[PDB]
Design a protein around this ligand. Structure first.
Ligand SMILES: *[C@@H]1O[C@H](CO)[C@@H](O[C@@H]2O[C@H](CO)[C@@H](O[C@@H]3O[C@H](CO[C@H]4O[C@H](CO)[C@@H](O)[C@H](O)[C@@H]4O)[C@@H](O)[C@H](O[C@H]4O[C@H](CO)[C@@H](O)[C@H](O)[C@@H]4O[C@H]4O[C@H](CO)[C@@H](O)[C@H](O)[C@@H]4O[C@H]4O[C@H](CO)[C@@H](O)[C@H](O)[C@@H]4O)[C@@H]3O)[C@H](O)[C@H]2NC(C)=O)[C@H](O)[C@H]1NC(C)=O
Ligand SMILES: *[C@@H]1O[C@H](CO)[C@@H](O[C@@H]2O[C@H](CO)[C@@H](O[C@@H]3O[C@H](CO[C@H]4O[C@H](CO)[C@@H](O)[C@H](O)[C@@H]4O)[C@@H](O)[C@H](O[C@H]4O[C@H](CO)[C@@H](O)[C@H](O)[C@@H]4O[C@H]4O[C@H](CO)[C@@H](O)[C@H](O)[C@@H]4O[C@H]4O[C@H](CO)[C@@H](O)[C@H](O)[C@@H]4O)[C@@H]3O)[C@H](O)[C@H]2NC(C)=O)[C@H](O)[C@H]1NC(C)=O
Ligand SMILES: *[C@@H]1O[C@H](CO)[C@@H](O[C@@H]2O[C@H](CO)[C@@H](O[C@@H]3O[C@H](CO[C@H]4O[C@H](CO)[C@@H](O)[C@H](O)[C@@H]4O)[C@@H](O)[C@H](O[C@H]4O[C@H](CO)[C@@H](O)[C@H](O)[C@@H]4O[C@H]4O[C@H](CO)[C@@H](O)[C@H](O)[C@@H]4O[C@H]4O[C@H](CO)[C@@H](O)[C@H](O)[C@@H]4O)[C@@H]3O)[C@H](O)[C@H]2NC(C)=O)[C@H](O)[C@H]1NC(C)=O
Ligand SMILES: *[C@@H]1O[C@H](CO)[C@@H](O[C@@H]2O[C@H](CO)[C@@H](O[C@@H]3O[C@H](CO[C@H]4O[C@H](CO)[C@@H](O)[C@H](O)[C@@H]4O)[C@@H](O)[C@H](O[C@H]4O[C@H](CO)[C@@H](O)[C@H](O)[C@@H]4O[C@H]4O[C@H](CO)[C@@H](O)[C@H](O)[C@@H]4O[C@H]4O[C@H](CO)[C@@H](O)[C@H](O)[C@@H]4O)[C@@H]3O)[C@H](O)[C@H]2NC(C)=O)[C@H](O)[C@H]1NC(C)=O
Ligand SMILES: *[C@@H]1O[C@H](CO)[C@@H](O)[C@H](O)[C@H]1NC(C)=O
Ligand SMILES: *[C@@H]1O[C@H](CO)[C@@H](O)[C@H](O)[C@H]1NC(C)=O
Ligand SMILES: *[C@@H]1O[C@H](CO)[C@@H](O)[C@H](O)[C@H]1NC(C)=O
Ligand SMILES: *[C@@H]1O[C@H](CO)[C@@H](O)[C@H](O)[C@H]1NC(C)=O
Ligand SMILES: *[C@@H]1O[C@H](CO)[C@@H](O)[C@H](O)[C@H]1NC(C)=O
Ligand SMILES: *[C@@H]1O[C@H](CO)[C@@H](O)[C@H](O)[C@H]1NC(C)=O
Ligand SMILES: *[C@@H]1O[C@H](CO)[C@@H](O)[C@H](O)[C@H]1NC(C)=O
Ligand SMILES: *[C@@H]1O[C@H](CO)[C@@H](O)[C@H](O)[C@H]1NC(C)=O
Ligand SMILES: [Ca+2]
Ligand SMILES: [Ca+2]
Ligand SMILES: [Ca+2]
Ligand SMILES: [Ca+2]
Lengths: 388, 388, 388, 388
């Protein structure tokens, strides 16, 4: 009942442990499970929940033929209990739309959904289950946002939005909201060239997002936000350990304020926890496909342009599919520091498994441990052949 | 915990944004979704909910053959969470009956359901989940009511009921209830000739319903109710922009106190927000069929008999089906004024899609914005051919 | 939070209105609805709920073949929300057993379930969701109880139990419980010859049950209980309007303290509200089969042995099946008097509809009105042929 | 809201009554019921719940082929309402893992789940729905725990864990936790040679577990724990009434501090309530297979090495399958003493019913009575042939 404030620093990440896995596509072969994609996790003062953009069909239903398409009037942001599947009967609709972000401010939740045609789309900001604010497209070419949770400090919750070309310069703005109302907005500043899908976290009153340059870098851009002064900056992660996908081989030296060239016009949503020596970067194992997933500790990745890994942990092996990943923490857990967590989308169906007509996913999430725990790999686990 | 009072005026409607869509018939192709019709939306102090008259079968179940019929013992008023489908497992039964209305008074909810044979039907008024009052038919030919929400001011909630011919003079009464008990009732007064299905809203202690003349007008009747004095009046909307269906072409001049002739004995439930310059009228695009849906701003429509549109927004295109529409507002939202909202029923199956044996629907709702947002069209989205 | 006390008298019953109908077997043709029988209704301080003995299968599931049998280890007492069907996902298990009764005492609920072989059965009394007391069989031949709700006054809730022959003399006892513990029990007294399945209600600190003589009467026995003194008496209803089934024609004169002969060894659970001039008796229309259902007002039925009906209302027509019926009232409704209510079981499947292999039912309930409302008939409504 | 303390002694067990039965596999033939095994029951201050390790498929779904295997990434600890089946829509996920234990401390619940490869597995301890502590494998060969509930006294909840060979010496430790944090741990002491799966209960501030020696005894080991001093001891049950399975014939004399030889390398989870004269031992009726189940009163079984039964009760007959059984009590029931309770797993499918490709189960539980109640047998009740 009073606003949350980013008081603590991150605990030290010596390894990762399972947090949630829902086995959605497995159980969807014989249950009324919704078709989704763009998943993420967000916590309330009293519970943590799984989130996704629905496609408005079940996996086994006939209107699943066609759900590879990204934007439509039948998608919505839904949430369901931790480690359960997105079922028709157990899901809660947050807002209607095909791009989204959501966070709790300590008092209540803000969710944002965008719908529209490509050239005349709008966002409407819901606070405490009601509509309060709406924003129309400014550059008229697919107004989009984070597709993962936002973060708040004493009432002000910043959200990044891009509008325009995915393949050239675009127009990006950071909006600062408080109780659903706009307090201020700014256009992108600093050296990042293109922004798409930021994954954010906060600690000691500052917010760090790791985004996706779709235009030209294979290294990732970082926006650092100060929620009290309401300002930001961008840079790229210095380290030569490249984490977009597709990507060239990792070099010996990296780039701090310019894109690393090699692949143009394509990518994936990813994240990193940037904390001096305690820094871990997540990435696909395949340099060409969204397959496999690994976590790599690369001390000072943001600043040291010659930093190489020191420790690692395999989350999904290279023979199984992965997808989008993002960052969340439970800011209301008891303790001296915030425990870092993440999720990875495990996509099944088209384009790669084109033997079915649908595209859906399950989720795995992980949080950190100060211990050095042994690892296991966490694949989706369905057999596509049962759906034929 | 104290009665709600209509204190505020309506905000200004410069455009409309999506509020809820449930994609019911799509998900019903492979889920246990109930067959409905006559949908509507109503809010409580803490949540808003979707409502409909059930037919007592699922879409894919065999007893769906025949659900084009309107009155039977297997129908009931049910409600379910906002933007979810009317599922067997997630629905709450309010009362049993084939005509209905419901509203919350700030303390608890009143729901009214009517059942009976055509010539010996009765209403029973439920307040706080219990039966309190019952009313028997007065003219002995299908006692019916609004099929959308009612509105209350400091305890008194007025409901319009018609009993008698749908094709001639009928007998209409406005009942004023407080905590489920009748305080007073009056017969219809003013110049409206026939009343059927009123859609109502309230602002600054007055209640405005826009009803359907089934006998002879293609322009709509308006009943204005004063809940403190408990009195009313009726008129027709002056404007030549005609909003019943079927209807003749729009004329150059309209009628304020007489039906506009052209079609007899047929129509549809509709609504309008009548607020001086801030007035918007909803209607089907097809003049002959319940297809398409548009919102048109017609300044002073109620009084100016030569008023033409000034701005518009397309809700459903003319190639897709629509149906009944109604008005609601969330009287418990924070803010200086009430935000105007509406829903449109999207009917699928018989009579027009006679290639199946059932009749069902989904819902779309919209609320207003002070912004000028771009539009999208919101069709049901099922493919009838998957049900064959 | 303090015990309920039977303070009020019954309102006057000038007619009956629908209360709940669940359309269970209809929706069970394509949903996961449980197979039941022996239904009833009971209210809490804040909600009223439907109740039944489950058979541990769904209608469409394969283990429904065989559910005509009455006693087994797979049955349980379950409850679900008013006017919803007994679904696998929406039902709450009260206790395990094949005979039962339940009531709320103003503080919490007592439910009683009996399980066992025919010759070594036991009751275990649950109070506030926990086991507190157990009772073993005293005559060793199917220990059974009411199969409808019990009634409490200031803590003491009396329950009737029979143990022994259904076709001769048996041993019946009235147990008086308070918070789940036995306070006292007595054997049957007065002139009733055989007791089976009592339906009870209470008003002005006295409790009236109308039971079933299975041995030899076609008129029904009445046990009157004083919950403060903890004593009772039995008699038969004097009136010649006979309400068991099967039964001979109604005579001109009836019997107050002896069975009316004509049918031996068979019957049905029924009820009556006995209140001087305000007395209404329920019965099947068929004298030979459990088909049809009617309510008949027979002034002073209990005492006047030559009393004939004065007013009636048809609940289910003679061409549709009915079954067991019982009495309940919502003792926590606002008002000056208790509104009388009842339910009728609508059995479908074997023995009469032997073209399927299962036996199940739906429910209809009704409460009274001081008005004279018109009637409708309320049949189950499924078509057996869809299950073939 | 203050920690629970084991204050009472056990009531006297003169017989057992049904508590819960869910009929899971029966209803699973036509419902969305999850495949499980290793079931158990645990109570909260306000409700008791059924628990199991899920396999991440439904019975009728295709990925049920293969669920005989014990460890995988698709299993999780789930709970659902008492006497309902583990349904996709009604289950709550506690933690992810293939071995587990859980108990409520009077303030909130601790659940522990283990996942990993055989040689690099870890436990993570959840307290109040969040991760707090993690423990890595110490002997690197399937780190496992109780698979039934743990017990707490004034904050400290002891858990037994084994890591290492199931067929030789292993390494067992008792961890003492308070609010999810480790207070202390000790290695096994006393005369028990091998520990696996302990079933525990507590009364008058001491905790008694009855475990399974997988290496060589057919008599069972007992660990007695003092939660204030945080220490323990082990012994074997003296009595010649042998309760592991498989097992040799019961001898005339038993062993108190050595394994009884006869079968090596195999067994089953079981339990006993050890209370002087009031002592009852549970066991399979088959000496060779997990079939049938009986309860036997063997006065002073723990100490008297020549003790024979004095009274018995058959729970499941020898022609039907049983499986794992464990102990729980509802420490928050009103009363002067704790009522002893237990559950038995009823396994269906492979290995014995190899005509299907899946392995699943239902549950029966029982609590004690001071009465001498008659018995019934409680089999699963599905017919495997309906699944073909
Ligand atoms: C029990 O559980 C424990 C805990 O999990 C297990 O122990 C863990 O084991 C992991 C696997 O070995 C290990 O992870 C590796 O750590 C390496 C860092 O360690 C180095 O330092 C130590 C000490 O400082 C030295 O002793 C040691 O010699 C090491 O050099 C990482 O280097 C590993 O990551 C790299 O390998 C994997 C696959 O093997 C690649 O996918 C990954 O991308 C890394 O390699 C690429 O990238 C680097 C950086 O640019 C390149 O230099 C390199 O050549 C590779 O480049 C190619 O590949 C990428 C991606 O495909 C491509 O983009 C690029 O262009 C090139 O093509 C790895 O992270 C854990 O650290 C260890 N944990 C602990 C606490 O010990 C234990 O094994 C389990 N089992 C048992 C039975 O106990
Ligand atoms: C991005 O999003 C924005 C926001 O949505 C989009 O901008 C909107 O675009 C809408 C479509 O053009 C527009 O809506 C129209 O507005 C007209 C009013 O504008 C007039 O005034 C302006 C300024 O004052 C003038 O500049 C302009 O010249 C206009 O004259 C309405 O007139 C329109 O409604 C009529 O047309 C539609 C179909 O086109 C009909 O269905 C509708 O019923 C109206 O026409 C019938 O009725 C009238 C009244 O009787 C008759 O006079 C007329 O002849 C028609 O009559 C026949 O049809 C009816 C029904 O079928 C039948 O019953 C009758 O008998 C006859 O047969 C329409 O409402 C928005 O106002 C505009 N919004 C804003 C804020 O700008 C933008 O386009 C999007 N796209 C991009 C890429 O940016
Ligand atoms: C609109 O709605 C309103 C409200 O519902 C409708 O009005 C109601 O209409 C009902 C049907 O007529 C009516 O119910 C009947 O009431 C009779 C009592 O009325 C008598 O008194 C009035 C005034 O005092 C007199 O004017 C009138 O002449 C009457 O004599 C009951 O007698 C009726 O019950 C009997 O008939 C039914 C079927 O018709 C039997 O099933 C039932 O069992 C009763 O008859 C049997 O039992 C008696 C008693 O032993 C025997 O004497 C008799 O011969 C029958 O015996 C045989 O049958 C039984 C059972 O099968 C068997 O066991 C036995 O052995 C024999 O074989 C009936 O209850 C309502 O009272 C009336 N309500 C009001 C408020 O007016 C209106 O019609 C609707 N429609 C429209 C368009 O408005
Ligand atoms: C109504 O309900 C009531 C209540 O349930 C019913 O009454 C109950 O009836 C039960 C069945 O008879 C009865 O249970 C038995 O109790 C025996 C103890 O009673 C003895 O003492 C009394 C009084 O002190 C004496 O009068 C009497 O003579 C008895 O000797 C137990 O001994 C019974 O258990 C043994 O038998 C069963 C099967 O019959 C075995 O499965 C079980 O394992 C026990 O026998 C094996 O084990 C012992 C110990 O080592 C061996 O000595 C023995 O030879 C057996 O060994 C073989 O089998 C085991 C397992 O297969 C194997 O491992 C081993 O190697 C050997 O191969 C049994 O528990 C209740 O006590 C009684 N309750 C009450 C309150 O009275 C009533 O019948 C119901 N019906 C009606 C119509 O009323
Ligand atoms: C956060 O900080 C503000 C301003 O310092 C304070 O009012 C608020 O109570 C703090 N939040 C909490 C949960 O203490
Ligand atoms: C999916 O749709 C395409 C055309 O859009 C059609 O050819 C194809 O056969 C459909 N797939 C299935 C399995 O229905
Ligand atoms: C509405 O008005 C009445 C009478 O003026 C007043 O008692 C009531 O409290 C008001 N409602 C609210 C919510 O303030
Ligand atoms: C629906 O009912 C009609 C007769 O009422 C029957 O002829 C028709 O075939 C039925 N339709 C289906 C699909 O069962
Ligand atoms: C019922 O009567 C008892 C004894 O007179 C009294 O204590 C109790 O409070 C009464 N119940 C209620 C709800 O008032
Ligand atoms: C039901 O069981 C009987 C034998 O008990 C069997 O002959 C019959 O065919 C079964 N009915 C169905 C539909 O399976
Ligand atoms: C348990 O004992 C502790 C220490 O004596 C005490 O503080 C606690 O309140 C007791 N628990 C309860 C429920 O009384
Ligand atoms: C199960 O899997 C095996 C191979 O793992 C396969 O041969 C078998 O036919 C499968 N069973 C079924 C019913 O699919
Ligand atoms: Ca890129
Ligand atoms: Ca009309
Ligand atoms: Ca009889
Ligand atoms: Ca052993």
């Amino acid at each position: 009942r009073d606003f949350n404030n980013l008081t603590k620093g991150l605990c030290t990440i010596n390894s990762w442990h399972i947090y949630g896995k829902d086995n959605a596509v497995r159980i969807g072969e014989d249950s009324d499970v919704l078709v989704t994609r763009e998943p993420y996790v967000s916590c309330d003062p009293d519970e943590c929940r799984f989130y996704a953009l629905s496609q408005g069909t079940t996996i086994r239903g006939k209107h699943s033929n066609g759900t590879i398409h990204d934007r439509s009037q039948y998608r919505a942001l839904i949430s369901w209990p931790l480690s359960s599947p997105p079922t028709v009967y157990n899901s809660r609709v947050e807002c209607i739309g095909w791009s989204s972000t959501s966070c709790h401010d300590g008092k209540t939740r803000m969710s944002i959904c965008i719908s529209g045609p490509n050239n005349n789309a709008s966002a409407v900001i819901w606070y405490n289950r009601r509509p309060v604010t709406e924003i129309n497209t400014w550059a008229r070419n697919i107004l989009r946002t984070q597709e993962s949770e936002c973060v708040c400090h004493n009432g002000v919750c910043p959200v990044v939005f891009t509008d325009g070309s995915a393949t050239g310069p675009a127009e990006t703005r950071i909006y600062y909201f408080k109780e659903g109302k706009i307090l201020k907005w700014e256009p992108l500043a600093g050296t990042a060239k293109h922004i798409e899908e930021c994954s954010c976290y906060g600690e000691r009153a500052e917010i760090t997002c790791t985004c996706r340059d779709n235009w030209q870098g294979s290294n990732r851009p970082v926006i650092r936000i100060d929620p009290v002064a309401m300002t930001h900056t961008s840079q790229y992660i210095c380290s030569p350990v490249l984490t977009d996908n597709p990507r060239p081989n990792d070099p010996t030296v990296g780039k701090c304020n310019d894109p690393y060239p090699g692949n143009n016009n394509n990518g994936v949503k990813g994240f990193s926890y940037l904390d001096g020596v305690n820094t871990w970067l997540g990435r696909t194992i395949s340099r060409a496909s969204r397959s496999g997933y690994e976590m790599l500790k690369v001390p000072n990745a943001l600043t040291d342009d010659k930093s190489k890994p020191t420790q690692g942990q395999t989350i999904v092996l290279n023979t199984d599919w992965s997808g989008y990943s993002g960052s969340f923490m439970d800011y209301w857990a008891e303790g001296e520091c915030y425990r870092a967590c993440f999720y990875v989308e495990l996509i099944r169906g088209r384009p790669k498994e084109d033997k079915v007509w649908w595209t859906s996913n399950s989720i795995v999430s992980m949080c950190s441990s100060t211990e050095f725990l042994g690892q296991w790999d966490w694949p989706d686990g369905a057999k596509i052949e049962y759906f034929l």
